[PDB]
Ligand binder design. Structure first.
Ligand code: HEM
Ligand SMILES: Nc1n[nH]cc1-c1ccc(O)cc1
Length: 394
């Protein structure tokens, strides 16, 4: 025999497997086995991905229930899976959303400054440079310290939790709990620290002492700090790293963007569309029996929404693998999800990538890989696809 098709198919974030277009054409929803042994439905067309993400009966929260078929082990307490629902129930959604927009005074200039400094330091040191460890990740870390209102010097230690926190493991991870409890203690300290008066933590700290929020738990306040730092940093650092690969490998596009930087937002949007940063489909648990294409998904089954399945669907995005700056539906991709759980940091993520790319093209217009592309080491069993190092010269 064969065996039931296993997911994920590949940890490489520089190319989509030809298999994905085959699945999408032949079986855009089909049964697969996850790393835990569970069965799941893998959905790989734009039409069916959108259907699942816009129907709340495919629940994010219920993926955390004891006994459910699992994509991977939880790395957070089960109540934290419903992190945005908990924020909304506490009456904090508007305030959190306001704090993480890129439009706060000085934020963009801070980003440009940070990027330019990181690049000057690479240039001083001489090629080769590692653009993930010494540019994309420290730019994301600095950004999220600023947005949180926490000291920049605390960013590296918070960051180092992330190579465990965002693992995609078959089994529970003891180091994840150790790092989680310590990071929650750090954020609780921030909330009690009178010097912290700006950003998302300064705003939470004020709301904590307002009568309108007196019955919101200290644990929820700390948890917002830890979760927004971690999701934001991993997601922006990983997206920028793999977007830089896709740009480096298209000298014609690199040169057009360098020359006409007003096209950078359109090119970022295409880079988001083609991005293979999410290593796994987005999980949902069916709360009812729901027809999805030719399959009747049954109550209690796991569904996995394959982002690249949707974003490379030629029925929605003709010539899907090409970066085309003049598409008529450019923001209609699923790179930030869709529906109830649409990314709350989408603007912030776009801006981080736009600024980092602008700054890199101006400082290193001759940027190129310093190693053959096949020599990049792809991180395995993780919730993002990322090269461990990204060696470049210029
Ligand atoms: C390019 C950067 C980013 C990408 C590609 C990205 C992508 C995503 C995707 C696909 C989802 C949907 C998950 C789902 O439906 O299961 C999501 C949710 C989430 N994002 Fe992002 N994200 C980015 C940046 C950020 C930033 C900057 C933050 C915070 C500062 C952030 C915080 C979150 C949180 C807290 C959620 C969960 C929302 C919910 O459960 O309602 N993201 N993101
Ligand atoms: N910050 C985190 N570390 N490990 C898991 C998370 C996390 C969990 C949920 C979430 O909405 C955002 C982030």
């Amino acid at each position: 025999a064969t065996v039931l098709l296993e997911v994920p198919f590949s940890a490489r974030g520089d190319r989509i497997p030809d298999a994905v277009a085959e699945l999408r054409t032949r079986e855009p929803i089909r049964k697969v086995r996850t790393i835990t042994g569970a069965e799941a439905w893998l959905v790989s067309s734009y039409a069916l991905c959108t259907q699942v993400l816009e129907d709340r009966r495919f629940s994010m929260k219920e993926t955390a229930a004891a006994g459910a078929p699992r994509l991977n082990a939880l790395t957070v307490p089960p109540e934290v899976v419903n992190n945005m629902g908990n924020i909304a129930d506490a009456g904090l959604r508007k305030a959190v959303m306001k704090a993480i927009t890129p439009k706060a005074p000085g934020l963009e200039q801070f980003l440009r400054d940070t990027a330019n400094s990181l690049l000057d330091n690479l240039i001083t040191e001489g090629a080769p440079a590692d653009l993930r460890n010494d540019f994309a990740d420290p730019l994301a870390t600095a950004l999220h310290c600023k947005v949180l209102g926490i000291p920049q010097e605390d960013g590296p230690k918070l960051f180092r939790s992330l190579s465990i926190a965002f693992m995609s493991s078959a089994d529970p991870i003891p180091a994840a709990k150790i790092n989680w409890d310590r990071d929650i203690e750090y954020m609780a300290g921030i909330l009690e620290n009178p010097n912290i008066t700006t950003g998302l933590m300064g705003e939470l700290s004020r709301l904590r002492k307002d009568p309108a929020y007196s019955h919101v738990s200290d644990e929820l306040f700390a948890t917002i700090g830890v979760t927004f730092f971690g999701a934001g940093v991993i997601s922006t650092g990983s997206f920028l790293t793999t977007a830089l690969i896709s740009l480096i490998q298209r000298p014609q596009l690199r040169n057009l963007l360098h020359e006409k930087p007003e096209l950078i937002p359109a090119g970022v949007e295409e880079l988001l569309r083609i991005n293979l940063s999410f290593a796994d489909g987005l999980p949902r648990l069916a709360t009812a029996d729901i027809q999805v294409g030719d399959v009747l998904v049954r109550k209690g089954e796991l569904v996995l929404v394959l982002l690249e399945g949707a974003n490379f669907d030629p029925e929605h995005f003709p010539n899907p693998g090409s970066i085309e700056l003049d598409r008529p539906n450019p923001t209609s991709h699923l790179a930030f999800g869709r529906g109830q759980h649409f990314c709350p940091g989408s603007a912030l993520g776009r801006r981080h990538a736009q600024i980092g790319i602008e700054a890199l093209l101006k400082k290193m217009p001759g940027v190129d890989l310093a190693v053959p592309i096949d020599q990049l080491v792809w991180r395995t069993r993780f919730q993002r696809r990322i090269p461990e190092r990204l060696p470049v010269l210029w």
